[PDB]
Design a protein around this ligand. Sequence first.
Ligand SMILES: CCCCCCCCCCCCC/C=C/[C@H](O)[C@H](N)CO
Ligand SMILES: CCCCCCCCCCCCC/C=C/[C@H](O)[C@H](N)CO
Lengths: 57, 57, 178, 276, 276, 251, 251, 251
Amino acid sequence: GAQVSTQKTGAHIIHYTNINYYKDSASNSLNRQDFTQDPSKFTEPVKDVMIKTLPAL
Amino acid sequence: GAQVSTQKTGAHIIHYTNINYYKDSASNSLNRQDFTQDPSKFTEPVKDVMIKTLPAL
Amino acid sequence: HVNSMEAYRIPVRPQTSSGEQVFGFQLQPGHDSVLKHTLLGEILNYYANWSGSMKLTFMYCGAAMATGKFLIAYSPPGAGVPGSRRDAMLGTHVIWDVGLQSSCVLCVPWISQTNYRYVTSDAYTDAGYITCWYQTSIVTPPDIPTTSTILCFVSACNDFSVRLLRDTPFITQQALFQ
Amino acid sequence: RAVGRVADTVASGPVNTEQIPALTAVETGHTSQVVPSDTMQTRHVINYHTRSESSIENFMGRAACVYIAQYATEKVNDELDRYTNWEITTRQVAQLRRKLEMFTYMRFDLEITFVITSSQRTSTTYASDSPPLTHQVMYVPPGGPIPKSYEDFAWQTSTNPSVFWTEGNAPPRMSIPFMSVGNAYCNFYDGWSHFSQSGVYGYTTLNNMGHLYFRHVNKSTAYPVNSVARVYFKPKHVKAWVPRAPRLCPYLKARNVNFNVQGVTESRNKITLDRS
Amino acid sequence: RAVGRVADTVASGPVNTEQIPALTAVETGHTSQVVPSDTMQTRHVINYHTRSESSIENFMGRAACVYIAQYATEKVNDELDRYTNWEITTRQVAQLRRKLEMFTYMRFDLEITFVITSSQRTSTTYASDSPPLTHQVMYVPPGGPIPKSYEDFAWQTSTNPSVFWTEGNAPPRMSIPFMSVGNAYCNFYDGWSHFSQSGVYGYTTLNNMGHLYFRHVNKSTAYPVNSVARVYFKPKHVKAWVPRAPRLCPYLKARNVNFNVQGVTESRNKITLDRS
Amino acid sequence: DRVRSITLGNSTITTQECANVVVGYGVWPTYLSDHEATAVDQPTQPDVATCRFYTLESVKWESSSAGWWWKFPEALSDMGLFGQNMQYHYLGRTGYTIHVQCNASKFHQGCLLVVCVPEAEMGAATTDHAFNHTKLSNIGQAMEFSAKKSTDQTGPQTAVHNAGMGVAVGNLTIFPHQWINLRTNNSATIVMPYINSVPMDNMYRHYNFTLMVIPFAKLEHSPQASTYVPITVTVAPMCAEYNGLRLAGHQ
Amino acid sequence: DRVRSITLGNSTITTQECANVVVGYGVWPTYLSDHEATAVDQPTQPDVATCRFYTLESVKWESSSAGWWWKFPEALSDMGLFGQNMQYHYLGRTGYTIHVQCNASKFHQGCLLVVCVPEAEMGAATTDHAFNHTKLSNIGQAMEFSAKKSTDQTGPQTAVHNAGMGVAVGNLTIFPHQWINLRTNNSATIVMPYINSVPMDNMYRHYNFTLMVIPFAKLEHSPQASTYVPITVTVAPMCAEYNGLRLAGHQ
Amino acid sequence: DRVRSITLGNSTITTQECANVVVGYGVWPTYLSDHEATAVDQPTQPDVATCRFYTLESVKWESSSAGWWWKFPEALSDMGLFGQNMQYHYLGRTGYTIHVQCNASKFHQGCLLVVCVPEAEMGAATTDHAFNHTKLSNIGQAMEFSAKKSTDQTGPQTAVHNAGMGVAVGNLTIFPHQWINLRTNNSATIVMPYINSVPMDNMYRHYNFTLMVIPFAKLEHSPQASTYVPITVTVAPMCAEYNGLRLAGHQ
Ligand SMILES: CCCCCCCCCCCCC/C=C/[C@H](O)[C@H](N)CO
Ligand SMILES: CCCCCCCCCCCCC/C=C/[C@H](O)[C@H](N)CO
């Protein structure tokens, strides 16, 4: 039940092991490595699509 | 995710195990066993090659 | 003007001669007083490093019968502040023609020698200046008020990133709130 | 390209087109998606930057002090009593409160860590020899029997969760799951507690998290000792919804959002810049 | 042959050749690659020696004390205040400074370890009984709100990284990644901070690493106690570029490379040797 | 394009200078799912007798107008059978189609922000004092901001640049919003979904969202033009459903 | 359509009422070919530090304005690194994107011819007399025509109906031109190629083309409208290259 | 061999007694890669108008000469269009071909170290005092060392055996260097790449490298030989590119 995952490294021996010790999922560590996002709920929440090159009106 | 590597021994039971515990690569130990080198950037940084046996000029 | 809605209202009017300045501020999106309480500026004060391009949008809120052209310029920080519209036409700039589309976007590019600038400002990571100038004038028909209004909006581009979490120097307390 | 990595900019040349990416309409509610490649000539840059530090788990996942609890081994009054309590809230400190109030509804698990420290009270003498002090931090769920004194039966903690800690060791720490009777923790509640639109206005009616009682389980000391217990909340497994505007004004109370009126930003002397 | 192992010498006999390995030209900037096999008769030696200790990771990877921070449980003045601070730098101690300044640009991760020790201040009496002291070492990134006093709100450390440590245990230790806004840490900067070639000359304008604030989180003691915290930097995952000449002259200041003029080496009485 | 027609029930909205439609957080309103419900009794869904357009009273826009706010669903407490279903039920749930409309001329100038703020919890004008609910919102009356601070002993803090919430008024553009710029824009329509931390709620003790209308660029014109411009708000509920039938409330 | 966006270097022009683009004699500017070159040394081509937009000073348009002229490349002699490359080089070669811009109102009226005349060699006002070069063109100043004849002892003949060239001003519409009619047109953009009888030339002793801006229908409006309308000229070099590097000129 | 010809732009260097070429740290200068850039705007690359040879003023070599230093790119601040591109741009990036030349005779004797030191940060002569920038380097003037220590109140410490950096002068042979031994060597050429911790930089607030020329064996000859020998420095930029076009600097 060991989860070997990728460590946070830079860009131009890179793995860590995790064992879960407790029977509750609230006892687990933080989910540091989850970087998913979609900003279209806030920046472009209009009904008809608005292409950049075309005039807005 | 265990990395078994060669221990530093002399010349004339020689292995160690490493588990990475943390999610950041800056949390890792030192890279003690990296002995690569190339001194030609400093000792012989000339454009044309200079053979030892031949005269330099 | 900060204690009213007059703080957001950049005033423009018909001119006697052209090429005068409308406004100007330093491009310090976490330290300058113009940009540090905006919604982009408040997130950056939780961090110590910022990187990426920004979008300055402008919005002409005058009458539909009034026309106008404007030059909005970004200057890299080497030479100092631009002193005229001739000094500002040498950097990154855009000429905005006020028409049926009321808005224009000046895109401030990331022109830096480091991959990150600092949120609290210093001289090593200075980012430059934003200025706006009258390209032509405001020309109106009769029976129209003189002074109009321009609204400036800030946002981050899709290559924007922040780094090195910190406490913000905006909220304080001397005791526990009871 | 990996998840969380920013976009590259593409090489763009000169244009003379009927396309107008710079001209838009703010009246539509739409934020324009203009890239620097659209308004000027750019080069191809391979951007390797990541949005790691800006995640909701990384922005929130640092422990912040939420309460300072004081209690002694000898009663002065009921503020420096043998025991003390704290209604569990996140609004008494300003640093964590401003970070949580950037969202309307959140849903997280907690880590509570205590930094308990003692100090000898000012006296005419201090020369004693005391065994190490041990503390109890009992959680009381909403509606349970609370300690009405020291030596109480309610400190028997047969069903309440307790922790015991001797001074000198590592700080105590436990994990708390998501505890709301709704589907999210409400940072804001625009309403009342009674149906007639009266009673208590605000988020106070949606915060029934219970109390946290502190004491010394040692019976006595030779000379009185004051203790201070700092409570540290670190949220983990965080979800968040409906991002709020950040707060301008400082806080005044813990149960209200009441403020004093302040200007929108700091001032300057003129609207232009005047050098060469 | 393994990586890092020195070269063997080969067996060479007598020569009478038109080859001249001994004669060269220093004017070319070239260091001659002459082996003892070229200028004399040698035997075959299998050299098993290794260049392990001479690696940049092994030469740098030992912890060195970089600062001695002093603070007390009772203020004398603002130098022996309740709290203290230190702008993070590597130039106040001379042993680590001379090792880092053998290179122009470096890039490393850090390990910071604190050796905190207390001592009872000189008084007319010492006979007391105090609980164990607990310390806080809060890091403040460049531009954050700094503690202006004890009992400050800025010690709530909701977003700043803090550490807490009771006396008696193991020394505290954390890891720091590579933190420069450029692509390497600059040990040297030949330039100014302002574009008009004025302001601050030197490496001081490229060092914005923040402060490190120290205090006792205990409120009081019966008699005042002075603490000393030693800061230990060990660089790991080290890269280095452009090797500098070692420094001859001792240092005078921490923000400059200013020196007093000294001779190139120690002297002797004559240039020859005169015995048999 | 600039034309748009919205039909809900027996009511139609036509607009000849429309900017666009802002849809919430990208979510269209819908009925509650079976895997998200809590109450067990069968809901009632009056589809056309409640999800129709209800117009409110106009407000006079002046040069010295600071702004107005409406709190919902309490703004429609007496609007037909939407108001009769609130009284007879314990729980309710709905999204909205807010339509704000204001025409002036090609010789007027001004700009209005139209935000929909979920849980716009307002502070008190005189602090250390709880305020009355009729100062927060009457039944359909437009509660209005002020240019300077309020010293009301039992009212909200109506200074408009702080927006009643202690925040900067310029940062309200994260909430679902449009602008009515009189140079180009005639109306502004926002479709809000149901935003709450519970699947249904009581529609009297809770203001789910607050509609604010704020002049950022003030109204100015020639004195020989029309000196009266009104601002009308037309709101349609969407996918409204109810639970917990008992006697008529609402105490 | 009426919208157009021109991006050159770090500068952008936006126009919401564009007539069209006039491209020269149907030729786009480009670099010199190998089978047409004469000089043998390698040219220098600063692609974005020189081929960017440089705006000049505005001129006030009045009812009694006769017109203005600019002579090129001498009009951009001090405009950034386009002016620094002229001083250090013997030869140069470039095409241009001329953009003239003037907005008034729907209550103004006027019309401007915008011609680009190659080799607009001007006669003298006082004949049997050679004129000064600073009367032909200063460095960026708009040299302006007159309604009646000129009696300047060392200047050009600036009567506008003869256009300084002894021709009829109405016949200038064979040179690449647009019109700015204030009823319909906001700006006017002309793309000029390199026109010369030699492949490269010296950019100081030769005015390659002259931009004239002439009111054919004069500016008139009500006295209660805006009495000041300016005319701004924004010029971008295109495919500029240079030869013959020596010390800084230009004598 | 001893002959070498270096051609860059419209300039050629010929040498009949060349030692060799020292190339940096084994790296040839080149333009910045796409996976290493930070700025997003298009750079300008004047290939032959900037990457040409620029010669400086000669310095008189005497028997009592301690040495001279030049700081770059500030040594070429006024050298043609390399100096004009520094003023108009925020960032710049270049490698160099340094060529130092000094001939005497077969009857003279001397030896010069020619080092290129990256980030040669100099200490102050009078300590606890910041020095002026014009004492570190003028625009093209050779700043010169001294045989004994300096007591200048606002200048660097110019004692040559400490090399201004607090190090031993004998240990400068790790930096890219040659020697001019008058017995055998006529000139000395060093090709330096771009060395910095950032991909581009400002070329005014930062001296990227310092060229030092130091007599290790002093000049001595018969009194009836030529008593004047000069030392000329000819420097060519290589692959110079720029970013951040704005007005002319440099404050
Ligand atoms: C002695 C053992 C102590 C055990 C401690 C248990 C106490 C924790 C239980 C309640 C947890 C409440 C979490 C608080 C969340 C915030 O109030 C929300 N952000 C606001 O609704
Ligand atoms: C209480 C928790 C303390 C956490 C400590 C964090 C402090 C470390 C952050 C900054 C690290 C800076 C590393 C310094 C590098 C040198 O200055 C470079 N060699 C010179 O540029």
